[PDB]
Amino acid sequence: ASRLYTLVLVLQPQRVLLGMKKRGFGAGRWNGFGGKVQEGETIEDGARRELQEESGLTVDALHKVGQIVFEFVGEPELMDVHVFCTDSIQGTPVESDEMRPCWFQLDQIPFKDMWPDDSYWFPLLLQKKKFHGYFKFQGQDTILDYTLREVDTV
Numbered sequence: 001a002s003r004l005y006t007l008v009l010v011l012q013p014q015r016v017l018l019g020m021k022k023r024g025f026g027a028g029r030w031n032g033f034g035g036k037v038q039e040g041e042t043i044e045d046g047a048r049r050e051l052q053e054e055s056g057l058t059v060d061a062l063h064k065v066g067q068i069v070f071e072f073v074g075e076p077e078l079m080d081v082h083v084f085c086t087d088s089i090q091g092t093p094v095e096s097d098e099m100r101p102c103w104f105q106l107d108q109i110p111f112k113d114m115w116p117d118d119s120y121w122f123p124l125l126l127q128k129k130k131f132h133g134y135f136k137f138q139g140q141d142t143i144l145d146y147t148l149r150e151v152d153t154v
């Protein structure tokens with residue numbers, strides 16, 4: 001019972017781009033760019049499309065960095081999130097009614113205003129490591145249990 005999602009982090013040597021979600025589930029947090037994979041599109045195609053829709057950026061080269069499964073107690077569907085990274089983009093980030101982009105220096109990542117699971121795997125992403133993770137949440141603020149392991153192949 002899992003649904004496919006993508007998450008894209010535009011990570012450059014000195015900075016990372018995040019977007020403040022304006023509405024819906026998880027509004028008020030800085031997150032990567034992503035969403036549900038559509039019928040007839042590959043996971044990577046879905047990741048490229050979501051980055052454009054949510055940030056206005058065009059990505060050519062994408063790299064798989066992680067796979068994270070999110071469980072929300074009381075919600076039947078698991079989120080099967082395929083995480084990707086790019087340092088190679090075109091365009092300028094665009095603010096829309098749904099999302100506000102902002103660049104962050106790597107030592108100023110706003111963890112207090114991000115999903116709690118980011119504090120576990122973002123440090124791996126910054127050190128160019130690949131990972132498989134699982135987080136079980138109660139509501140939007142509490143991690144009940146989790147697992148996280150580094151892998152060589154995502």
Ligand SMILES: Nc1ncnc2c1[nH]c(=O)n2[C@@H]1O[C@H](COP(=O)(O)OP(=O)(O)OP(=O)(O)O)[C@@H](O)[C@H]1O
Nearest residue numbers: 021024025026027031032034035036070115117118
């Ligand atoms: N680290 C994280 N942990 C948990 N949830 C996260 C997360 N990062 C992140 O973006 N999310 C949530 O993941 C969800 C992604 O789904 P979404 O943005 O609503 O997209 P959709 O599948 O509806 O398609 P879209 O509207 O085209 O983007 C949102 O509810 C975000 O709050």
